[PDB]
Ligand binder design. Structure first.
Ligand SMILES: NC(=O)c1ccc[n+]([C@@H]2O[C@H](COP(=O)([O-])OP(=O)(O)OC[C@H]3O[C@@H](n4cnc5c(N)ncnc54)[C@H](O)[C@@H]3O)[C@@H](O)[C@H]2O)c1
Ligand SMILES: NC(=O)c1ccc[n+]([C@@H]2O[C@H](COP(=O)([O-])OP(=O)(O)OC[C@H]3O[C@@H](n4cnc5c(N)ncnc54)[C@H](O)[C@@H]3O)[C@@H](O)[C@H]2O)c1
Ligand SMILES: NC(=O)c1ccc[n+]([C@@H]2O[C@H](COP(=O)([O-])OP(=O)(O)OC[C@H]3O[C@@H](n4cnc5c(N)ncnc54)[C@H](O)[C@@H]3O)[C@@H](O)[C@H]2O)c1
Ligand SMILES: NC(=O)c1ccc[n+]([C@@H]2O[C@H](COP(=O)([O-])OP(=O)(O)OC[C@H]3O[C@@H](n4cnc5c(N)ncnc54)[C@H](O)[C@@H]3O)[C@@H](O)[C@H]2O)c1
Ligand SMILES: *c1nc2c(ncn2[C@@H]2O[C@H](COP(=O)(O)O)[C@@H](O)[C@H]2O)c(=O)[nH]1
Ligand SMILES: *c1nc2c(ncn2[C@@H]2O[C@H](COP(=O)(O)O)[C@@H](O)[C@H]2O)c(=O)[nH]1
Ligand SMILES: *c1nc2c(ncn2[C@@H]2O[C@H](COP(=O)(O)O)[C@@H](O)[C@H]2O)c(=O)[nH]1
Ligand SMILES: *c1nc2c(ncn2[C@@H]2O[C@H](COP(=O)(O)O)[C@@H](O)[C@H]2O)c(=O)[nH]1
Lengths: 390, 390, 390, 390
């Protein structure tokens, strides 16, 4: 019959909104708050949404959440918490290599299979072949980072991130090739990059994932000091679009402030999301809580801040501050998971993989927001209010 | 793994060419020769291509070919031949109603099941419930056409076409409602229309298919005489795009000169293709062969030509001429079928339904042709040549 | 082989971002904060970046930094400091000609070769043929400015700037020709201009450099009072693009607030950058430090402010205020130098000359910033923070 | 020779910026702060700029300044002051007709020629044939306004303005025709209008000038309450462009905050500028000065405010407030005159007539301003400052 024979199941579906390609073709320099995702069709419940994510070519996580390698964010405690909730943590390298290797060992010795030296309480916990938690580590691109890498490999790190503001450098590519030849099984994350040209240079060197973002971080002043960077949403879309031609996952790094930002980054092509300030002042973050006028808060600083580089003339690229206490990771990360699942349900996708497939196929639709639209989208017209997320 | 998890099976597939929507958004006023279909991916053979087509809401044919209701094209002989090759013929009404009903009866009595008054030699032959060939008939929108319709319904016609140059009229809509209430099972084809506004008016009246085309016919001079019409490719695309919102098939009528034109019309949203000149001077066309300077050819005239309307000032809308002999329908239609199948294979679709699904989804891609491109596409740079299609 | 023969060394390099010409063709009226420079490829260290800059046709400096001719900014002390750090200072003329000539003499007698009447402590110090520091001076376009010019030429000034808000005037052109005929060796800077038409008029008169900017200065209210001016980034790009057709350097004047602004101005085609407020409240700036509620700060006023013109009815074009203490030039200018070098390294250029060559060739790429993008580029999501640049 | 024969005196003059027609074709909905005028060529001094302006077809003023018919702005004192400084005042009608006629008489009896029962202290003072100051008056479009008009005509008013928010009404057109037939010599100003369609309706009725502006006034809330209006700069340009086809002058009404705004309105096609808040809290404004926390200020209210309409259900269209004391008109208006003259000198025109001629010919050029550009154009980067206009 005609109702089937005219177009074969694919029905009318009025065209309304912009595709991602149309949205990011305009060259406006958009970030997360400049656009929304239009809703789709719902025929399933939120709890059925699958958040399985690729961290690298060969490392898969049950959630897309990653803690940033920052000395005020990720040490062994935070890494264990993120592994237990289904993500991963990357241990910072603003320390001695022995200290870093000890932190990696503490992460890797939390759970064991056959000890050669709880699984039910944490179903989403990611594990390697030997029933051990996964762990990540940051290294630089200088000469001593080779010895640091040897210690980390001995400690049993599963993935290393090359920590730099501008990853498209001869130093970074040289260390990528060094690692590829000396530890052929080790997974390497390159970055940070914001353009497809940088991305091509790093993928040709053989990275297993790309870290995307420059200047969007909450503690960053790189854009205003060095005049270099890119709006985060455009950067994530462009680099993910390039990298998926070669099957390279993208980690979206910097500027994430809420669940909506996480969902937008995943919809734009990122496979995982890296969080700094959002996970600072949690119980598992390193450092100690302190009070400033009846407010509980913790230190949070950028790695390019003068205090961070203290332990010639130094050009600071980050600031040092404090953020309000958020509580425990074991209570905060489930809220993020539920929020992402609800966002996926609203846009009509059963999984993050299907979200990205719909985006690349043009089925997922977007819309811009003017300044008035953003104000309307926020809380308005109230004398006073209380905001309780969960 | 990441190779699956990044976008879920849907690979890169570099973007190249225009979608049909993009092509017909430019407002250039394109017809068939102004564009091409870009090739796709082939993983099947040409003979496996399915050409099942919807003529109306409830009438399905094995091929998309229809013979036009013209007194130099379709009588009982042509109708039987087209039914036997898998299409259908529409018997013209430039005759008395008794003559038309007799032609319909001759078509409907060619093959029988249980005669109440070969099926393997012609596998593609379309048949109704009682194993009889299908037949179509044209009627006008004047008062006496009701009596003509009664005679045709008694003769057992399966579908009637309302024959007019401009179908968006109060007369046509009145007769559509008359037919709907008096013969609730009879299928009605409305037209001719070239715009979505006309199409909406006719679909609201309850037609089961639309006949699309005004001024594109080979014998027609309506565009130059009445300044009204539309380029055929744009008309087919626009009207099919509107009509498929309601599950109404479109017959593309006029200006078809070759297999490439048939394939283009089907790719643009038409479900069947109506042919005039292409089927004139076949053996089954009415009239007798005659010679003019060693060339065998037959009369072919437009219904709005003065000779056609002869049997008060008449404004002619068509010319009368002759076309070269093509041979038999039973040998010519298989060539068209094979050509359409090869076109479908080249663009990478298993069926006409899938062709249209790909076009509406944006997977099928198109390209414009300049005048130099069209010349290049034709035969060139030769001293002399012979063109043998089959 | 094909890897070389296909395109000869020039590899793919995916296209991403806008060229400067594309960015400033849109007519949006951009200034510095509306765009960023995308990062390039790094294969050298920051300290290897060469900042040699052309102040005029024949005067070359080792850094691109120039102090503005303002009575709260540049006197002999500031001029000596800027000469010693590799730049130059322009002595203001809101004084008597004898006072100005004495300041020029004090600058020119700081270092000597063969005295006819430290080289290692300051390697970047600019010097003339006779091992003396270079010095600049401002003059007006009125009649007595000829006598002022005679005194300055006797004092041995190396370059004079014609000080005006709108340099495209018959008065300015007359004085330019006067100076060219009377002091054929003296270098003349014309301005201020913001359009290529003004620039053509001044280059035809024979200037050796152009001063670009109108209304962008921190103390300026010309745009709001006289409705005339231009956004600074667009002005710098347009005028530099015109002036380089004739080999005329451009000084970018006004609205510089940080190292990122300096880098952007140099990337847009300027050869040197003139600074007002950024160098006010340094130790070498004229005037005395004073306290307002525990904050140390110095007077800073525009030359078109009523206080400035006090020493008929006067239309003020500038305001008078105070800015916070910055410390010494000998410590602040090295920070600017290091910042510019780091910006050049990030965008992948070995020198300012190569930065501009990449920009004109289209290799350097830019990106716009929405308001949300600018907010994201700034410090955000923090309860409190401290910003220590160096 | 070729230097003349190639193009005949008209030289290259590089193309840079936008014409007014290009600027206002974009449909962005610009007001005064969204654009600047680019500078031109200066070959004359500021005092030589001629500000002669057409108020109506037959009434010419030496300055383009007009005081608004508002009960907190214009009574006899303000009307006399504006006439003496070269402009005109329009006496408000929120009073009895006898009171209004008495104010008109007080204005018309200030200076006399041959008294039927100083002119060198005020050279710019506008005068009629009998050496008397000109005076304007506002009337409504209701029935009793005819009697009010009779009293005003007897008092000797020279021009009447029809006071309404939306002037394109049958009531306004009826009163325009009434006035034209009963007082054939009286000059009538119609409005307020913001579109060319309204302008055509009023010009067809026979107005001698148009009052342009709806919702832009400082005390107005019409746009937010009735959703109707237009950005003032676009409104002035569009309506002036239409009205000059018929030789009808335009008064730009509302939203003027400074000299730059006046200059922009005149450059966009207006012949005179009407001022409300800018002239409120001057000594000559009606009402009494009063103090609020050490600040001297005066009442200023919109005519559509509830207090104004007090003396069944009233929809307020204006608010009531207070503005800071500005001093005397005799000192403030000369500042405006000098500012306008300086703006004309900067853009390179000898007169307002030549400003508009250059604008219509495309020689005058404009530029847009982003939000960052506007911030840059303002005062910035200062700890504190003092702004003394004159
Ligand atoms: N993502 C961001 O936007 C961002 C911005 C600023 C800082 N940061 C963080 O701050 C930290 C440091 O910043 P960075 O990017 O300057 O790190 P970095 O230490 O890589 O850079 C230091 C400098 O040394 C150079 N360098 C690097 N390797 C070298 C080698 N082998 N030989 C010679 N020179 C070499 C670099 O090009 C750079 O000029 C990192 O944690 C980084 O992630 C991040
Ligand atoms: N598709 C084309 O481009 C095209 C163009 C011209 C002619 N033709 C063919 O030629 C033939 C005649 O052309 P036509 O369209 O003029 O046919 P038509 O007979 O419908 O038109 C005849 C005229 O009579 C009017 N009319 C129709 N029904 C009426 C009624 N009940 N009462 C009063 N007036 C009425 C029509 O509006 C038209 O003016 C048809 O075969 C048509 O298919 C086709
Ligand atoms: N760059 C800017 O945006 C800007 C803006 C305002 C003021 N300023 C500074 O403030 C100071 C004020 O200078 P200015 O440009 O306001 O005015 P200026 O000192 O050049 O002269 C002011 C007026 O005198 C006229 N004039 C100049 N030379 C003349 C001559 N020979 N004969 C007759 N008339 C002549 C000018 O055209 C102008 O109307 C300067 O320091 C200037 O650099 C700079
Ligand atoms: N944007 C502006 O320029 C603006 C906006 C609001 C108010 N105002 C000022 O406030 C005052 C009043 O505003 P307004 O425009 O409502 O004045 P208005 O008195 O003309 O309007 C009063 C109402 O009566 C109607 N009306 C007018 N004449 C009539 C007649 N002869 N018969 C029947 N109905 C008639 C009008 O259409 C309107 O609905 C005026 O001073 C006006 O200038 C100005
Ligand atoms: C600029 N960016 C910096 C610096 N240190 C780290 N970073 C980047 O910021 C991310 C965290 O940002 P949040 O918005 O707080 O999530 C980090 O992951 C890293 O990429 C710095 O000093 N200057
Ligand atoms: C214009 N068009 C006419 C006329 N009679 C019929 N037609 C239309 O032409 C079609 C055939 O065109 P070909 O190109 O030869 O296939 C018919 O089906 C009909 O729609 C006429 O008089 N003037
Ligand atoms: C407007 N602009 C003025 C005035 N005096 C000087 N200037 C200009 O400003 C520049 C300094 O600006 P900063 O942003 O503080 O660097 C000067 O170099 C000069 O060009 C004035 O009165 N009104
Ligand atoms: C809206 N607009 C009103 C009202 N009364 C007068 N007006 C308009 O505003 C102009 C003055 O505006 P300023 O910006 O203060 O110069 C007047 O001339 C008139 O056109 C009102 O109640 N609501």
């Amino acid at each position: 019959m005609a109702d089937y024979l005219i177009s074969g199941g694919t029905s009318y579906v009025p065209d309304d909104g912009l595709t991602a390609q149309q949205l990011f073709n305009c060259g406006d320099g958009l970030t997360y708050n400049d656009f929304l995702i239009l809703p789709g069709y719902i025929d399933f419940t939120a709890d059925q949404v699958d958040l399985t994510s690729a961290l690298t070519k060969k490392i898969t996580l049950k959630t897309p959440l990653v803690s940033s390698p920052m000395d005020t964010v990720t040490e062994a405690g935070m890494a264990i918490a993120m592994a237990l909730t289904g993500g991963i943590g990357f241990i910072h390298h603003n320390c001695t290599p022995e200290f870093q290797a000890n932190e990696v060992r503490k992460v890797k010795k939390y759970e064991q299979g056959f000890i050669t030296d709880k699984n039910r309480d944490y179903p989403l916990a990611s594990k390697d072949a030997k029933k051990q938690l996964p762990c990540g580590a940051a290294i630089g691109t200088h000469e001593d980072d080779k010895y640091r890498l040897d210690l980390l490999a001995q400690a049993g790190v599963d993935v290393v991130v090359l920590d730099s503001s501008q990853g498209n450098s001869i130093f970074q590519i040289n260390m990528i090739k060094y690692i590829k030849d000396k530890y052929p099984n080790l997974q390497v994350i390159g970055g940070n990059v914001v353009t497809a040209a940088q991305a091509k240079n790093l993928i040709d060197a053989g990275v297993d994932a790309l870290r995307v973002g420059m200047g969007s971080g909450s503690i960053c002043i790189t854009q205003e000091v060095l005049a270099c960077g890119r709006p985060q949403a455009t950067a994530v879309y462009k680099v993910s679009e390039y990298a998926r031609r070669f099957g390279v996952p993208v980690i979206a790094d910097g500027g994430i402030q809420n669940v909506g930002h996480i969902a937008k980054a995943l919809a734009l092509g990122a496979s995982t999301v890296m969080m700094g300030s959002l996970l600072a002042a949690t119980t598992e973050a390193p450092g100690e809580y302190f009070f400033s006028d009846g407010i509980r808060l913790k230190k949070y600083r950028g790695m390019g801040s003068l205090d961070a580089m203290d332990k010639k003339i130094k050009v600071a690229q980050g600031v040092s501050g404090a953020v309000q206490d958020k509580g425990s990771i074991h209570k905060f990360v489930p809220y993020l998971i539920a929020g992402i699942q609800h966002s996926c349900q609203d846009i009509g996708a059963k999984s993050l993989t299907q979200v990205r497939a719909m985006m690349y196929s043009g089925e997922l639709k977007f819309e811009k927001r003017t300044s008035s639209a953003q104000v309307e989208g926020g809380v308005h017209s109230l004398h006073s209010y209380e905001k309780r997320l969960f």
